[PDB]
Write an enzyme that holds these catalytic residues in place. Structure first.
Site, PDB file in Angstrom:
ATOM      1  N   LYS A   1       0.711  -1.182  -0.245  1.00  0.00           N
ATOM      2  CA  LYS A   1       0.113  -0.478   0.173  1.00  0.00           C
ATOM      3  C   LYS A   1       0.549   1.080  -0.039  1.00  0.00           C
ATOM      4  CE  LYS A   1      -0.976  -0.031   4.855  1.00  0.00           C
ATOM      5  NZ  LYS A   1      -1.805  -0.768   6.444  1.00  0.00           N
TER       6      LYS A   1
ATOM      7  N   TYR B   1      11.357  33.171   5.205  1.00  0.00           N
ATOM      8  CA  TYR B   1       9.719  34.622   5.535  1.00  0.00           C
ATOM      9  C   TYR B   1      10.191  34.643   7.245  1.00  0.00           C
ATOM     10  CZ  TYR B   1       8.895  32.863   0.142  1.00  0.00           C
ATOM     11  OH  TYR B   1       8.860  32.930  -0.723  1.00  0.00           O
TER      12      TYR B   1
END
Lengths: 384, 384
Positions: free
Chosen positions: A50, A276
């Protein structure tokens, strides 16, 4: 992230990829052989693939699975199923979650054994197979351990009732009964295992099922390794195929490293800030390394002012906010860091290691929460 | 996540995707036309399409770009660039982060303008251009606002020298100077803008550059909308194209929604627990919907016992740990929820909204840190 691919396969190289997931073929095959040796032919192996082989690439991983003669494969999505089949694999293929109806309908073409947890669902699914003139093999899921996720609640009379209704569907063929453990703790696994033994016994007796046509399966990696009596007919191991399992079990090798590139190193004066919102202030004239990886590559924002990476074996810290595509690291103390150097975001480098535990501590959750999404957001490259 | 794709394009549908990203064409076109009208022809528009168009699909977005005559596109990786060219885009293509040298070299074939923020990098980049018999157009990054990420520090004398060195490279043709703002704040922006103007003056004078042969660009989305004097020759807008920008600027429409399916709804009795480690206890006889999305699809583990989704317009809570591939939500108060129902994970549904704000609150960081990874981990479907 490749924008062109063919059954899990890309045309990229380390040289032209900003960041990449390195998948070791030989670590995979070693872990398979180790697991097979541990089962010792008393139980069979189903490789749980999976999440695109847990971010390792289902299309990269399948040739090892086929090579080692693994008889069973478990997937989650229709594309995973399609890739398993296109790889030539012809054995037992089962979905380890409930599908939606239209997703299930689209996967009939792959001869996948589907998971069922409900009378209503079983009714709906039965009508879909009838419409296509197919007999659909189903694994009935039981809630023995108590996930309360895929399974029917067999500790009530309503549950036992749904379970008989499920066995009454003409175009479904019941081939298995399963459960999944909710807690990686030996005691709790054994509680769940006892409940699963009682509830399958009850079903098999009272719904007059053939025990011999059913595969009973409960164990994941943890249970398989720590609680042998949970092995039953078949085990469903994901993490251990990849070396993500019980920390003490060091016989399982890590199949994945996460890497990038130094694009350039730059000089910045003391008092300068980085990234930032200026969250880091340079306390001295620095040399900052610019690394071509960011949060769009799965190098999550939370690693802001927290992550460490490895370049030339050195443990170098992340400074400032992680950008969308770029990460700054402080190489003031490491004059040997140059443009073009290989970076290790997760794994080992010349004596250094970025550990599973250090990352989980920063992330606030298990590593699969990051690496399943590394695998999607960057090209995978088979090595070894 | 498609395991086959051709230039950012897949063969999947809503009906066979466990989860998907819906990209609204008409929102994208509205946002472009609005940006353009706002720039009123006074300043050039460069669409920033980093990070596979911020998770929206560069292959999906390009035709709007070409049709509205956007003359400039900014990207980060080689695959993006390759896709931009394959889509028939013939205009200006600029990388907005530093590339590693071998990355840069592999990109020559896309005639991309490359970013440069170092003399050393410049020399290295000069030599590749030489070796290939090409003149590489470059933008020079300046650290005017103090990202300290890509640009040269022109606030020092060694900075200035590095700058002049860059302009001296024989196989590099400087076509632009740029900077990037570090704080989304009007005043902070003007501070950086004043520095950019000085430092570009200084450089133009001292390198004896033809101002009229140069593009000066500083502004991203916030600056563009909030400080028009920062618009200069050309702006670089990312979020605004996608409706992720200044919250008051409602003229820009949200271009993305994140959706999934209900696979089935299950009954479970009071006192059952849900998911790994039993982190939620049912206080009443319950109906739990099983939704086919999980952290490997980008629905992060942090949403455990925290997220809400929409089904039939109802606000419905996530219960238990988010699994790799499956998410459990409580639909005891909502009997209209059935297998098949469409789930909204982010966006709007019949009067309900899952907001940017609420998701940013659970995640501890901006929404792009989620949606750029949603876009990688799931099929993108064009609507409107």
């Amino acid at each position: 992230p490749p924008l062109s691919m063919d059954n899990g396969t890309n045309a990229l190289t380390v040289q032209n990829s900003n960041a990449w997931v390195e998948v070791s073929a030989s670590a995979l095959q070693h872990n398979i052989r180790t697991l097979q040796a541990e089962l010792a032919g008393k139980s069979r192996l189903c490789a749980v693939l999976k999440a695109d082989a847990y971010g390792h690439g289902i299309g990269l991983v399948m040739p090892s699975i086929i090579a080692q003669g693994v008889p069973c494969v478990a997937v989650a999505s229709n594309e995973e199923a399609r890739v398993v089949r296109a790889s030539g694999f012809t054995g037992q293929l089962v979905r380890v979650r409930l599908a939606s109806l239209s997703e299930l309908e689209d996967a009939l073409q792959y001869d996948m054994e589907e998971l069922v947890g409900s009378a209503e669902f079983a009714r709906q699914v039965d009508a879909i197979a009838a419409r296509h003139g197919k007999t659909l093999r189903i694994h009935m899921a039981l809630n023995s351990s108590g996930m309360s996720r895929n399974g029917v609640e067999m500790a009530t009379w309503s549950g036992r009732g749904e379970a008989l209704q499920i066995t009454d569907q003409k175009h479904l063929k019941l081939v298995a009964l399963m459960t999944h453990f909710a807690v990686e703790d030996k005691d709790d696994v054994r509680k769940g295992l006892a409940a699963f033994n009682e509830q399958t016994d009850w079903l098999i007796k009272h719904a007059k099922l053939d025990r011999s046509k059913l595969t009973l399966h409960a164990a994941n990696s943890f249970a398989t390794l720590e609680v042998p009596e949970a092995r039953l007919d078949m085990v469903r191991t994901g993490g251990a195929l990849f070396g993500d399992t019980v920390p003490a079990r060091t016989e399982y090798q890590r199949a994945m490293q996460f890497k990038s590139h130094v694009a350039a190193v730059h000089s910045y004066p003391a008092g300068n800030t980085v990234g930032y919102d200026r969250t880091f202030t340079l306390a001295r004239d620095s040399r900052l390394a610019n690394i071509t990886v960011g949060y769009s590559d799965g190098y999550r924002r939370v690693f802001t002012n927290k992550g460490h990476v490895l370049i030339n074996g050195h443990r170098i810290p992340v400074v400032g906010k992680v950008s969308m595509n770029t990460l700054m690291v402080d190489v003031t103390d490491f004059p040997d860091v140059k443009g073009g150097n290989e970076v290790v975001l997760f794994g080992k480098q010349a004596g250094g290691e970025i550990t599973q535990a250090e990352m989980e501590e920063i992330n606030g959750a298990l590593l699969a929460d990051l690496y399943t999404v590394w695998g999607s957001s960057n090209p995978k490259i088979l090595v070894d």
